[PDB]
Design a protein around this ligand. Sequence first.
Ligand SMILES: [Mg+2]
Ligand SMILES: [Mg+2]
Lengths: 86, 122, 80, 90
Amino acid sequence: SERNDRKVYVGKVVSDKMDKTITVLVETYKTHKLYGKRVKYSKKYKTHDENNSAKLGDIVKIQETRPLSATKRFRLVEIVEESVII
Amino acid sequence: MIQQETRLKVADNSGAREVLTIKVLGGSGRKTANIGDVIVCTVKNATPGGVVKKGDVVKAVIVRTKSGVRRNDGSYIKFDENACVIIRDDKGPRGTRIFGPVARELREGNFMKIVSLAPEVL
Amino acid sequence: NIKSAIKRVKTTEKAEARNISQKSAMRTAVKNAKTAVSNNADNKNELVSLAVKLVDKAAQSNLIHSNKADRIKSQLMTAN
Amino acid sequence: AVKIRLTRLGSKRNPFYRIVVADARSPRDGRIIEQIGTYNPTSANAPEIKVDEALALKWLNDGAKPTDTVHNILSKEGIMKKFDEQKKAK
RNA sequence: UUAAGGAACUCGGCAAAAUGACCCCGUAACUUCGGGAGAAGGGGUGCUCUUUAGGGUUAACGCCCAGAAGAGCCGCAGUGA
RNA sequence: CCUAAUCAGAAAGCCACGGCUAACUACGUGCCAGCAGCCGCGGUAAUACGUAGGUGGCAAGCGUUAUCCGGAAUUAUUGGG
RNA sequence: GGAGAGUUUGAUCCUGGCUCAGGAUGAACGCUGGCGGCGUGCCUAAUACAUGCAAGUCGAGCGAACGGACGAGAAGCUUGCUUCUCUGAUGUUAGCGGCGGACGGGUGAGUAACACGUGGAUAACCUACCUAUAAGACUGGGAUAACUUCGGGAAACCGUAGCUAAUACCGGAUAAUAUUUUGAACCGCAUGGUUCAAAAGUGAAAGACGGUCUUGCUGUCACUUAUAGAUGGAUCCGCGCUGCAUUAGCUAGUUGGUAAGGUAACGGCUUACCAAGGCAACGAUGCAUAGCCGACCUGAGAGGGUGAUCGGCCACACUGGAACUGAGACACGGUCCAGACUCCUACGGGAGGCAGCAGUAGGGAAUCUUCCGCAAUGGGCGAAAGCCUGACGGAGCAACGCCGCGUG
Ligand SMILES: [Mg+2]
Ligand SMILES: [Mg+2]
């Protein structure tokens, strides 16, 4: 169906040491109900890489997929910015 | 044949699972016993709950003997195990059930409450 | 207690016997089919086209219903 | 299995039915899909009613067995004259 | 060797019987951290057929070595003594 | 529900009265019986005990007990040290 | 829209705790007592339960029995009795078969998680009935309950030998996007999707009632295939959602891949192989406690506490497990099994499940009538009348609460 511009989430990578797979750490910062401030807590979304194309430390975003396996759903869509020693 | 210091299973709703045969009531120093013979036993273990407890001492009536009895028709019988049932000289038990089938020659001794309950008179 | 469903009991037993005969007749037909894949004569087309008729002679009633039938045809109409 | 129908809402003795579309599986006094119209069998005889009569036809065009107690008043408002005037049109 | 019972014998389980090999799972208290620990407890093991991993040795042939998977056969019992 | 008839005849109590709290006098009592939410009364003249009278509150409802929030700025981001 | 008062000391100001005044209860207890309107009533033992009802309906689909209005021939003459023959209206219900029993009602033991709420997705799904549309609605057969007859069975119920039908069941014919296979165009969020062309593939009740009546014709309903619509359901996702760190390592089908199988569908959902990853102080895990939400109480407000009634979601049905029918259940009044419990028995063996309405015992400080009715609304079957409806309307008991009048 053509309705969803999928949930696109920027992130960076934490591993490539599994087949067809990487582990993005997308991150945000969200407020706290009692107070009125902001603070940042991360997650670790697993992923389906096509052939382990992109790297560790890479800067990439993703999209909703469908359940492909047990505790990985998302795809890769587009690596934005790749580099080595920083 | 059942005798002093012999461990048995049981059949009833006691809270107990096996016993010990102190003495084998009858005569003047009987050694033995078979089907029908009341005995004086105690308790060496227990499942939880139930009326009776460890260290207790009560009577019992033997049934399901492993060297069975000869019927006067010339037929015999044999179980695999030994067992007993608890009793209070009503010649009616404490328990509410009887697992583990029964030998019928109890009937001569005028026991019928446990024969009401036993699958099967055999 | 029981009131009326005793009807649906007897009916359930009749349709039990019927339905299992349909299904298992198919399953043996499929066994023949897959076993005919190894073979070289034909001896395949008769059997496989027959069974692919039977799937539908028996699918309209029971719980399969179509999607899984179409998966069975999907794999089985191709292996020969 | 979809039936416009009535959902009494008053308390003890003064009921105020509501017209509403629903699937028959549900309870009466519970869950619905969308209200339309209303009803009030007293405080004025003949009753006091409203009606959508704009989208109330929507639910009939795509399926309903509207009950008789409703069918009566829809006739009293006469929207069913448009309903059949399209259905038995062709 | 011995059915039923199983230390009641007995100064005392003296003696006798039971356990016992290989592999696998697992393995408490306490501890001078090394151990306890083979703890305990528990399981499998035979012949045939098929398929497969293999390693050493050689030009290669074949000669050796010891695993896995399935499928079957028998007898009460497969480290059958 | 309405309409006419009949009789003020059937239809009122609970708690508290030192302060906190609106609401005082007499008897008995004498560190005894007792009250108590707090502070505290009581050892022969008790406005705090028990009794009466009267008063205040409250109402076909009233007092006590248990629970929750408030007052609590006594977890304080508004709102602390 | 918001208030302070007391209390440590010989007397003082501070910091600091405790107590009081107010409001509220699914409330009990003491005292007392007139009435009406409205609303409520096992918060504990998810403990066990006698007695009654709580889900059937269609003869306008079917075979088969009862029935006897009406008509009438002889009559034993008792001139209306009746023998048979019987004409057969209206009706019934045992049975087969179709749809419903899964909705509706009831409780909250479990559950710390996509269970719940909220916002999303499905180029990873399903969907009887009801609507709309299009097409069809051909040709055959064999059995079987009731019913007769035999036997075993205490009873439960079981089998024997004939016989009968159907919108029952089974074949064939025919039927497109429905499955494989081939190619052109078009499209995108990646796997993929939409349409067109060509080879193989499956159905139906010859049905019932009615009018015209040529029994033709055609109608209402009904059946089948297909495409939609809507409805109901499913999975996935982001976020919020409890307490302890005197709970800091957990996990091996775990995590990832390959293939197969499986399911409506995706997926370690499950098998065989390769691999050693995965999760965690941003609190994994383990532990005790608990159904959640809309909302209710309070407070000026931020906030604090609870999850009664009413409504939405979920799980459960003596405990536990599995599966058939079916569109949908792994089934609240259905089965099968094992278990505990209660019960009947000729002792061979069988029967049952109120956390449905009432009601009983039991515990507890404490929570009611074994009510009338289907008029209404909503259900279920039907062509309709109609039938069933302890849902529900509505009477009864409790000062349990709110509101109101008065005892002049
Ligand atoms: Mg021994
Ligand atoms: Mg010993």
